[PDB]
Amino acid sequence: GMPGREILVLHVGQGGNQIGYNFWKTICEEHNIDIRSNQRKSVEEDKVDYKSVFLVEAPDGFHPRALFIDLEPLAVEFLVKEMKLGSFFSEDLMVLSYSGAHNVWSIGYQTGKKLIPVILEKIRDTMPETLQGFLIIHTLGGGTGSGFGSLLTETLKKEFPGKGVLNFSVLPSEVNDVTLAPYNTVLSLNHLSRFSDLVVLFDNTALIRIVKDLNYPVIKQFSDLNFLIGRVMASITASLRFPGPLNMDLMEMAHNLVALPETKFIIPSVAPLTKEESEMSTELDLVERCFDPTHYMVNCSGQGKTISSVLMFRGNIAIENAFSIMTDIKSNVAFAPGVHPDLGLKYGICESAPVDFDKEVTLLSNNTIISEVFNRVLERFDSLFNRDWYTSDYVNAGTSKSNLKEARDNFDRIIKIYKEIEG
Numbered sequence: 001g002m003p004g005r006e007i008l009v010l011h012v013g014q015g016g017n018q019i020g021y022n023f024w025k026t027i028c029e030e031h032n033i034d035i036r037s038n039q040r041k042s043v044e045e046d047k048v049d050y051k052s053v054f055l056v057e058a059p060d061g062f063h064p065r066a067l068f069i070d071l072e073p074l075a076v077e078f079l080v081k082e083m084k085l086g087s088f089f090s091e092d093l094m095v096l097s098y099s100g101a102h103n104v105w106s107i108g109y110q111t112g113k114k115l116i117p118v119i120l121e122k123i124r125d126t127m128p129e130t131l132q133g134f135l136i137i138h139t140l141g142g143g144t145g146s147g148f149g150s151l152l153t154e155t156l157k158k159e160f161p162g163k164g165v166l167n168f169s170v171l172p173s174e175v176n177d178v179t180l181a182p183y184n185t186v187l188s189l190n191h192l193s194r195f196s197d198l199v200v201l202f203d204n205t206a207l208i209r210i211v212k213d214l215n216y217p218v219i220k221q222f223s224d225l226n227f228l229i230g231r232v233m234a235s236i237t238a239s240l241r242f243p244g245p246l247n248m249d250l251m252e253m254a255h256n257l258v259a260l261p262e263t264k265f266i267i268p269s270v271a272p273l274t275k276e277e278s279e280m281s282t283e284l285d286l287v288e289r290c291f292d293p294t295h296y297m298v299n300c301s302g303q304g305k306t307i308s309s310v311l312m313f314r315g316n317i318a319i320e321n322a323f324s325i326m327t328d329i330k331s332n333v334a335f336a337p338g339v340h341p342d343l344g345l346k347y348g349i350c351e352s353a354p355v356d357f358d359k360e361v362t363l364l365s366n367n368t369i370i371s372e373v374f375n376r377v378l379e380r381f382d383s384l385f386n387r388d389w390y391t392s393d394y395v396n397a398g399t400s401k402s403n404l405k406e407a408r409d410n411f412d413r414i415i416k417i418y419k420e421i422e423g
Protein backbone atom coordinates (compact mmCIF):
# COMPACT_ATOMS: atom_id res chain seq x y z
CA GLY A 1 0.00 0.00 0.00
CA MET A 2 0.97 3.62 -0.63
CA PRO A 3 0.70 6.05 2.30
CA GLY A 4 -1.83 8.86 2.25
CA ARG A 5 -5.55 9.60 1.88
CA GLU A 6 -6.50 7.04 4.55
CA ILE A 7 -10.04 7.33 5.94
CA LEU A 8 -11.33 5.91 9.22
CA VAL A 9 -14.99 4.87 9.10
CA LEU A 10 -16.92 5.06 12.38
CA HIS A 11 -20.18 3.09 12.46
CA VAL A 12 -22.27 4.32 15.40
CA GLY A 13 -25.53 2.78 16.57
CA GLN A 14 -27.48 -0.25 15.45
CA GLY A 15 -28.49 1.16 12.07
CA GLY A 16 -25.05 2.56 11.28
CA ASN A 17 -23.36 -0.76 12.07
CA GLN A 18 -25.93 -2.86 10.19
CA ILE A 19 -25.42 -0.62 7.13
CA GLY A 20 -21.73 -1.52 7.34
CA TYR A 21 -22.47 -5.01 6.01
CA ASN A 22 -23.28 -3.93 2.46
CA PHE A 23 -21.18 -0.76 2.69
CA TRP A 24 -18.08 -2.89 3.22
CA LYS A 25 -19.26 -5.71 0.95
CA THR A 26 -19.69 -3.23 -1.91
CA ILE A 27 -16.30 -1.63 -1.21
CA CYS A 28 -14.64 -5.05 -0.97
CA GLU A 29 -16.22 -6.34 -4.18
CA GLU A 30 -15.43 -3.20 -6.18
CA HIS A 31 -11.78 -3.51 -5.09
CA ASN A 32 -11.64 -7.27 -5.89
CA ILE A 33 -11.63 -8.36 -2.24
CA ASP A 34 -13.71 -11.12 -0.63
CA ILE A 35 -15.20 -9.99 2.68
CA ARG A 36 -15.45 -13.58 3.96
CA SER A 37 -11.78 -14.48 3.41
CA ASN A 38 -10.18 -11.01 3.79
CA GLN A 39 -8.25 -11.93 0.61
CA ARG A 40 -8.39 -10.84 -3.00
CA LYS A 41 -10.98 -12.39 -5.29
CA SER A 42 -8.71 -12.81 -8.33
CA VAL A 43 -5.17 -12.13 -9.45
CA GLU A 44 -6.84 -9.83 -11.98
CA GLU A 45 -6.15 -6.32 -10.73
CA ASP A 46 -6.06 -2.79 -12.03
CA LYS A 47 -2.54 -1.37 -12.10
CA VAL A 48 -3.62 1.51 -9.84
CA ASP A 49 -6.28 1.02 -7.17
CA TYR A 50 -6.88 3.29 -4.16
CA LYS A 51 -8.17 0.49 -1.94
CA SER A 52 -5.93 1.79 0.87
CA VAL A 53 -8.34 4.72 1.36
CA PHE A 54 -10.84 2.52 3.22
CA LEU A 55 -9.02 -0.83 3.53
CA VAL A 56 -5.90 -1.82 5.47
CA GLU A 57 -3.55 -4.28 3.75
CA ALA A 58 -2.23 -6.50 6.53
CA PRO A 59 0.03 -9.49 5.78
CA ASP A 60 -2.85 -11.88 6.47
CA GLY A 61 -5.26 -9.98 4.23
CA PHE A 62 -7.44 -6.90 3.94
CA HIS A 63 -9.30 -5.36 6.87
CA PRO A 64 -11.61 -2.34 7.17
CA ARG A 65 -10.06 0.84 8.54
CA ALA A 66 -13.13 1.18 10.71
CA LEU A 67 -14.37 1.22 14.28
CA PHE A 68 -17.73 -0.40 15.06
CA ILE A 69 -19.17 1.49 18.02
CA ASP A 70 -22.42 0.81 19.85
CA LEU A 71 -23.95 1.00 23.32
CA GLU A 72 -25.52 -2.44 22.74
CA PRO A 73 -24.14 -5.62 21.11
CA LEU A 74 -27.14 -6.34 18.86
CA ALA A 75 -25.80 -4.84 15.62
CA VAL A 76 -22.36 -6.46 15.85
CA GLU A 77 -24.09 -9.80 16.44
CA PHE A 78 -25.83 -9.19 13.11
CA LEU A 79 -22.40 -8.78 11.50
CA VAL A 80 -20.45 -11.52 13.28
CA LYS A 81 -23.19 -14.12 13.82
CA GLU A 82 -26.00 -13.58 11.30
CA MET A 83 -23.66 -12.49 8.49
CA LYS A 84 -20.81 -14.74 9.72
CA LEU A 85 -18.19 -12.08 8.90
CA GLY A 86 -16.26 -12.07 12.18
CA SER A 87 -12.96 -12.28 10.28
CA PHE A 88 -13.68 -8.87 8.69
CA PHE A 89 -15.73 -7.23 11.46
CA SER A 90 -13.25 -8.21 14.14
CA GLU A 91 -13.28 -7.45 17.85
CA ASP A 92 -10.17 -5.25 17.76
CA LEU A 93 -12.32 -2.77 15.79
CA MET A 94 -15.29 -2.93 18.20
CA VAL A 95 -15.95 -0.39 20.95
CA LEU A 96 -18.99 -1.84 22.70
CA SER A 97 -21.18 -1.18 25.72
CA TYR A 98 -24.26 -2.94 27.09
CA SER A 99 -26.18 -0.15 28.85
CA GLY A 100 -28.01 1.17 25.79
CA ALA A 101 -29.44 4.53 24.77
CA HIS A 102 -33.20 3.77 24.75
CA ASN A 103 -33.70 5.90 21.61
CA VAL A 104 -32.77 9.10 23.50
CA TRP A 105 -30.14 11.40 21.98
CA SER A 106 -29.00 12.59 25.41
CA ILE A 107 -28.36 9.09 26.77
CA GLY A 108 -26.21 8.23 23.77
CA TYR A 109 -24.21 11.44 24.19
CA GLN A 110 -23.63 10.92 27.92
CA THR A 111 -23.00 7.16 27.93
CA GLY A 112 -20.71 7.43 24.91
CA LYS A 113 -18.57 10.00 26.71
CA LYS A 114 -17.26 7.17 28.90
CA LEU A 115 -16.10 5.39 25.72
CA ILE A 116 -14.35 8.40 24.15
CA PRO A 117 -10.93 7.91 25.84
CA VAL A 118 -10.66 4.32 24.60
CA ILE A 119 -11.79 5.40 21.12
CA LEU A 120 -9.22 8.20 20.92
CA GLU A 121 -6.61 5.77 22.27
CA LYS A 122 -7.28 3.30 19.45
CA ILE A 123 -7.11 6.05 16.82
CA ARG A 124 -3.70 7.28 17.95
CA ASP A 125 -2.25 3.80 18.48
CA THR A 126 -3.57 2.24 15.26
CA MET A 127 -4.25 4.91 12.64
CA PRO A 128 -1.50 6.19 10.32
CA GLU A 129 -0.14 9.71 10.68
CA THR A 130 -1.20 10.44 7.07
CA LEU A 131 -4.87 9.85 7.95
CA GLN A 132 -6.90 12.43 6.04
CA GLY A 133 -10.03 12.26 8.20
CA PHE A 134 -13.05 10.33 9.39
CA LEU A 135 -16.33 9.09 7.91
CA ILE A 136 -19.20 8.68 10.39
CA ILE A 137 -22.11 6.44 9.36
CA HIS A 138 -25.10 6.64 11.68
CA THR A 139 -28.85 7.16 11.89
CA LEU A 140 -30.40 10.24 13.47
CA GLY A 141 -33.69 8.94 14.88
CA GLY A 142 -32.37 6.92 17.80
CA GLY A 143 -30.03 7.56 20.70
CA THR A 144 -26.70 5.88 20.01
CA GLY A 145 -26.36 6.82 16.35
CA SER A 146 -27.65 10.32 17.09
CA GLY A 147 -26.18 11.19 20.49
CA PHE A 148 -22.95 9.19 20.42
CA GLY A 149 -22.69 10.06 16.73
CA SER A 150 -22.99 13.77 17.51
CA LEU A 151 -20.36 13.34 20.23
CA LEU A 152 -17.91 11.59 17.90
CA THR A 153 -18.42 14.22 15.20
CA GLU A 154 -17.70 16.91 17.80
CA THR A 155 -14.82 15.08 19.50
CA LEU A 156 -13.00 14.19 16.28
CA LYS A 157 -13.26 17.74 14.93
CA LYS A 158 -11.85 19.14 18.19
CA GLU A 159 -9.08 16.57 18.68
CA PHE A 160 -8.14 16.44 14.96
CA PRO A 161 -8.83 19.93 13.59
CA GLY A 162 -6.68 19.44 10.48
CA LYS A 163 -8.60 16.34 9.36
CA GLY A 164 -11.95 16.03 7.62
CA VAL A 165 -15.11 14.82 9.35
CA LEU A 166 -17.67 13.48 6.86
CA ASN A 167 -21.10 12.30 8.00
CA PHE A 168 -23.39 9.88 6.17
CA SER A 169 -26.50 10.48 8.29
CA VAL A 170 -29.76 8.56 7.90
CA LEU A 171 -32.96 10.53 8.54
CA PRO A 172 -35.98 8.86 10.19
CA SER A 173 -39.02 7.87 8.19
CA GLU A 174 -41.33 10.88 8.20
CA VAL A 175 -44.50 8.79 8.45
CA ASN A 176 -43.36 5.62 10.29
CA ASP A 177 -40.77 6.14 13.01
CA VAL A 178 -40.27 6.38 16.75
CA THR A 179 -42.04 9.18 18.61
CA LEU A 180 -38.75 10.61 19.91
CA ALA A 181 -37.27 10.86 16.40
CA PRO A 182 -37.95 14.61 15.81
CA TYR A 183 -36.16 15.48 19.06
CA ASN A 184 -33.21 13.25 18.17
CA THR A 185 -33.00 14.50 14.58
CA VAL A 186 -33.02 18.19 15.55
CA LEU A 187 -30.45 17.58 18.29
CA SER A 188 -28.20 15.61 15.93
CA LEU A 189 -28.54 18.02 12.99
CA ASN A 190 -27.70 20.91 15.32
CA HIS A 191 -24.50 19.20 16.49
CA LEU A 192 -23.57 18.16 12.94
CA SER A 193 -24.02 21.72 11.65
CA ARG A 194 -21.54 22.95 14.27
CA PHE A 195 -18.82 20.30 13.97
CA SER A 196 -19.20 18.32 10.74
CA ASP A 197 -17.60 19.42 7.47
CA LEU A 198 -20.19 17.73 5.23
CA VAL A 199 -23.45 15.92 6.00
CA VAL A 200 -24.83 13.63 3.29
CA LEU A 201 -28.39 12.74 4.31
CA PHE A 202 -30.25 9.50 3.63
CA ASP A 203 -33.97 8.98 4.25
CA ASN A 204 -35.60 5.61 4.86
CA THR A 205 -38.79 7.34 3.68
CA ALA A 206 -37.36 8.04 0.23
CA LEU A 207 -36.10 4.47 -0.22
CA ILE A 208 -39.44 3.03 0.90
CA ARG A 209 -41.28 5.37 -1.47
CA ILE A 210 -39.40 4.08 -4.53
CA VAL A 211 -40.47 0.48 -3.86
CA LYS A 212 -44.01 1.52 -2.94
CA ASP A 213 -44.22 3.59 -6.14
CA LEU A 214 -42.74 -2.99 -9.96
CA ASN A 215 -39.16 -4.11 -9.89
CA TYR A 216 -38.63 -4.98 -6.25
CA PRO A 217 -35.78 -3.09 -4.50
CA VAL A 218 -36.69 -4.48 -1.06
CA ILE A 219 -38.12 -7.95 -0.47
CA LYS A 220 -37.33 -8.23 3.26
CA GLN A 221 -37.45 -5.49 5.88
CA PHE A 222 -34.31 -3.52 6.76
CA SER A 223 -32.04 -6.22 5.30
CA ASP A 224 -32.70 -4.60 1.89
CA LEU A 225 -33.20 -0.95 2.88
CA ASN A 226 -29.87 -0.97 4.72
CA PHE A 227 -28.53 -3.08 1.87
CA LEU A 228 -29.54 -0.33 -0.57
CA ILE A 229 -28.26 2.47 1.69
CA GLY A 230 -24.85 0.85 2.06
CA ARG A 231 -24.57 0.51 -1.71
CA VAL A 232 -25.48 4.18 -2.24
CA MET A 233 -23.08 5.60 0.35
CA ALA A 234 -20.42 3.28 -1.08
CA SER A 235 -21.19 4.62 -4.57
CA ILE A 236 -20.74 8.25 -3.48
CA THR A 237 -17.32 7.39 -2.00
CA ALA A 238 -16.07 6.18 -5.40
CA SER A 239 -14.53 9.61 -6.00
CA LEU A 240 -12.33 8.97 -2.96
CA ARG A 241 -11.46 5.39 -3.99
CA PHE A 242 -10.78 5.54 -7.73
CA PRO A 243 -8.62 7.64 -10.07
CA GLY A 244 -10.14 10.05 -12.53
CA PRO A 245 -11.15 13.68 -13.05
CA LEU A 246 -13.36 13.57 -9.94
CA ASN A 247 -10.81 11.85 -7.69
CA MET A 248 -11.05 13.74 -4.40
CA ASP A 249 -10.01 13.77 -0.79
CA LEU A 250 -12.41 14.56 2.05
CA MET A 251 -11.50 18.25 2.16
CA GLU A 252 -11.99 18.71 -1.60
CA MET A 253 -15.33 16.90 -1.40
CA ALA A 254 -16.68 19.39 1.15
CA HIS A 255 -15.22 22.48 -0.60
CA ASN A 256 -16.94 21.58 -3.88
CA LEU A 257 -20.28 21.65 -2.04
CA VAL A 258 -20.02 23.89 1.05
CA ALA A 259 -20.34 27.45 -0.25
CA LEU A 260 -21.28 29.00 3.09
CA PRO A 261 -20.27 27.21 6.31
CA GLU A 262 -23.94 26.69 7.20
CA THR A 263 -24.73 25.01 3.84
CA LYS A 264 -23.19 21.60 4.52
CA PHE A 265 -26.21 19.29 4.08
CA ILE A 266 -26.13 17.31 0.83
CA ILE A 267 -28.85 15.33 -0.97
CA PRO A 268 -27.46 12.22 -2.71
CA SER A 269 -29.08 10.70 -5.77
CA VAL A 270 -28.03 7.48 -7.51
CA ALA A 271 -29.26 5.69 -10.64
CA PRO A 272 -29.66 2.83 -11.42
CA LEU A 273 -31.17 1.27 -8.28
CA THR A 274 -32.10 -2.23 -9.50
CA LYS A 275 -30.63 -4.62 -12.05
CA GLU A 276 -33.81 -4.59 -14.16
CA GLU A 277 -33.69 -0.80 -14.48
CA SER A 278 -29.97 -0.95 -15.35
CA GLU A 279 -30.46 -3.31 -18.31
CA MET A 280 -33.14 -1.04 -19.83
CA SER A 281 -31.55 2.36 -19.14
CA THR A 282 -29.03 4.64 -20.85
CA GLU A 283 -26.61 7.30 -19.64
CA LEU A 284 -29.10 10.09 -20.40
CA ASP A 285 -31.85 8.34 -18.43
CA LEU A 286 -29.62 7.86 -15.38
CA VAL A 287 -28.65 11.54 -15.30
CA GLU A 288 -32.24 12.73 -15.74
CA ARG A 289 -33.28 10.34 -12.97
CA CYS A 290 -30.61 11.68 -10.60
CA PHE A 291 -32.06 15.17 -11.06
CA ASP A 292 -35.58 13.79 -10.56
CA PRO A 293 -36.72 14.46 -6.96
CA THR A 294 -38.24 10.96 -6.87
CA HIS A 295 -34.80 9.30 -6.88
CA TYR A 296 -33.43 11.69 -4.26
CA MET A 297 -32.33 9.80 -1.17
CA VAL A 298 -34.19 12.55 0.71
CA ASN A 299 -37.97 12.94 0.40
CA CYS A 300 -38.56 16.18 -1.52
CA SER A 301 -41.82 17.49 -2.97
CA GLY A 302 -40.04 18.97 -5.98
CA GLN A 303 -36.60 20.05 -7.04
CA GLY A 304 -35.17 23.16 -5.44
CA LYS A 305 -32.48 25.60 -6.55
CA THR A 306 -28.98 24.15 -6.79
CA ILE A 307 -26.08 25.88 -5.03
CA SER A 308 -23.33 23.35 -5.76
CA SER A 309 -23.59 19.95 -7.40
CA VAL A 310 -21.24 17.06 -8.22
CA LEU A 311 -22.21 14.29 -10.66
CA MET A 312 -20.21 11.13 -11.38
CA PHE A 313 -20.38 8.71 -14.30
CA ARG A 314 -19.31 5.21 -13.26
CA GLY A 315 -18.44 2.34 -15.58
CA ASN A 316 -18.81 2.00 -19.35
CA ILE A 317 -19.62 5.60 -20.29
CA ALA A 318 -18.88 7.18 -23.66
CA ILE A 319 -17.17 10.45 -22.80
CA GLU A 320 -18.58 12.32 -25.81
CA ASN A 321 -22.12 11.35 -24.84
CA ALA A 322 -21.27 12.55 -21.32
CA PHE A 323 -20.11 15.92 -22.66
CA SER A 324 -23.20 16.43 -24.83
CA ILE A 325 -25.67 15.22 -22.20
CA MET A 326 -24.42 17.56 -19.47
CA THR A 327 -24.79 20.61 -21.74
CA ASP A 328 -28.51 19.93 -22.14
CA ILE A 329 -29.02 18.91 -18.50
CA LYS A 330 -27.46 22.14 -17.21
CA SER A 331 -29.97 24.27 -19.12
CA ASN A 332 -32.96 22.59 -17.42
CA VAL A 333 -31.46 22.52 -13.91
CA ALA A 334 -32.70 25.35 -11.68
CA PHE A 335 -29.74 26.98 -9.94
CA ALA A 336 -29.82 29.29 -6.95
CA PRO A 337 -29.89 33.01 -7.85
CA GLY A 338 -26.33 34.29 -8.06
CA VAL A 339 -24.81 30.98 -9.16
CA HIS A 340 -22.80 31.51 -12.33
CA PRO A 341 -24.25 29.72 -15.39
CA ASP A 342 -21.21 27.42 -15.64
CA LEU A 343 -20.22 27.19 -11.96
CA GLY A 344 -22.99 25.18 -10.29
CA LEU A 345 -22.48 21.68 -11.67
CA LYS A 346 -19.42 19.42 -11.84
CA TYR A 347 -19.38 16.13 -13.76
CA GLY A 348 -16.73 13.44 -14.03
CA ILE A 349 -16.22 9.87 -15.20
CA CYS A 350 -14.96 6.92 -13.16
CA GLU A 351 -13.83 3.86 -15.11
CA SER A 352 -14.49 1.47 -12.22
CA ALA A 353 -18.03 0.12 -12.28
CA PRO A 354 -20.43 -1.04 -9.57
CA VAL A 355 -20.60 -4.81 -9.23
CA ASP A 356 -24.22 -5.23 -10.33
CA PHE A 357 -24.41 -2.53 -13.02
CA ASP A 358 -22.47 -1.78 -16.20
CA LYS A 359 -23.10 1.95 -15.66
CA GLU A 360 -23.98 4.16 -12.71
CA VAL A 361 -24.64 7.87 -12.20
CA THR A 362 -24.34 9.47 -8.76
CA LEU A 363 -25.34 13.01 -7.79
CA LEU A 364 -24.35 15.00 -4.71
CA SER A 365 -26.30 18.25 -4.48
CA ASN A 366 -26.26 21.15 -2.03
CA ASN A 367 -29.87 22.04 -2.81
CA THR A 368 -32.13 24.66 -1.23
CA ILE A 369 -34.97 22.11 -1.16
CA ILE A 370 -33.42 20.74 2.05
CA SER A 371 -35.16 23.66 3.77
CA GLU A 372 -38.49 22.01 2.91
CA VAL A 373 -37.24 18.69 4.30
CA PHE A 374 -35.97 20.45 7.43
CA ASN A 375 -39.23 22.38 7.83
CA ARG A 376 -41.18 19.11 7.98
CA VAL A 377 -38.74 17.93 10.66
CA LEU A 378 -39.27 21.26 12.43
CA GLU A 379 -43.07 21.05 12.40
CA ARG A 380 -42.98 17.52 13.84
CA PHE A 381 -40.57 18.78 16.50
CA ASP A 382 -42.91 21.66 17.37
CA SER A 383 -46.04 19.47 17.34
CA LEU A 384 -44.59 17.62 20.36
CA PHE A 385 -42.39 20.22 22.06
CA ASN A 386 -45.10 22.89 22.28
CA ARG A 387 -47.23 20.37 24.22
CA ASP A 388 -44.27 19.14 26.32
CA TRP A 389 -44.83 15.64 24.94
CA TYR A 390 -42.20 12.89 25.21
CA THR A 391 -39.72 15.35 26.77
CA SER A 392 -39.31 13.69 30.18
CA ASP A 393 -36.32 11.47 29.36
CA TYR A 394 -34.23 14.09 27.57
CA VAL A 395 -34.54 16.13 30.76
CA ASN A 396 -33.58 13.23 33.04
CA ALA A 397 -30.57 12.52 30.79
CA GLY A 398 -28.99 15.98 31.01
CA THR A 399 -30.68 17.87 28.15
CA SER A 400 -32.98 20.63 29.34
CA LYS A 401 -36.09 21.77 27.50
CA SER A 402 -34.17 25.01 26.99
CA ASN A 403 -31.40 23.02 25.29
CA LEU A 404 -34.03 21.36 23.09
CA LYS A 405 -35.27 24.83 22.12
CA GLU A 406 -31.73 26.05 21.41
CA ALA A 407 -31.07 23.20 18.98
CA ARG A 408 -34.46 23.89 17.39
CA ASP A 409 -33.83 27.62 16.92
CA ASN A 410 -30.37 27.03 15.44
CA PHE A 411 -31.88 24.31 13.24
CA ASP A 412 -34.37 26.92 12.03
CA ARG A 413 -31.50 29.33 11.36
CA ILE A 414 -30.05 26.80 8.90
CA ILE A 415 -33.42 26.53 7.14
CA LYS A 416 -33.68 30.31 6.74
CA ILE A 417 -30.12 30.58 5.39
CA TYR A 418 -30.95 28.00 2.72
CA LYS A 419 -34.23 29.79 1.98
CA GLU A 420 -32.42 33.11 1.45
CA ILE A 421 -30.08 31.51 -1.09
CA GLU A 422 -33.18 30.22 -2.88
CA GLY A 423 -34.53 33.78 -3.06
Ligand SMILES: Nc1nc2c(ncn2[C@@H]2O[C@H](COP(=O)(O)OP(=O)(O)O)[C@@H](O)[C@H]2O)c(=O)[nH]1
Nearest residue numbers: 013014015139141142143144145172177204226
Ligand atom coordinates in the same frame (compact mmCIF):
# COMPACT_ATOMS: atom_id res chain seq x y z
N1 LIG B 1 -32.87 2.96 6.92
C1 LIG B 1 -32.53 2.36 8.06
N2 LIG B 1 -32.87 2.91 9.25
C2 LIG B 1 -32.53 2.30 10.40
C3 LIG B 1 -31.83 1.11 10.43
N3 LIG B 1 -31.66 0.77 11.73
C4 LIG B 1 -32.23 1.72 12.51
N4 LIG B 1 -32.77 2.66 11.68
C5 LIG B 1 -33.50 3.88 11.98
O1 LIG B 1 -32.94 4.48 13.12
C6 LIG B 1 -33.97 5.07 13.87
C7 LIG B 1 -33.74 4.74 15.34
O2 LIG B 1 -32.34 4.67 15.52
P1 LIG B 1 -31.62 3.25 15.77
O3 LIG B 1 -30.37 3.16 14.94
O4 LIG B 1 -32.55 2.10 15.47
O5 LIG B 1 -31.27 3.29 17.34
P2 LIG B 1 -29.79 3.57 17.91
O6 LIG B 1 -29.09 2.28 18.23
O7 LIG B 1 -30.05 4.45 19.24
O8 LIG B 1 -28.98 4.40 16.94
C8 LIG B 1 -35.28 4.52 13.35
O9 LIG B 1 -35.88 5.57 12.64
C9 LIG B 1 -34.92 3.50 12.32
O10 LIG B 1 -35.75 3.62 11.19
C10 LIG B 1 -31.48 0.54 9.22
O11 LIG B 1 -30.84 -0.53 9.16
N5 LIG B 1 -31.84 1.18 8.05
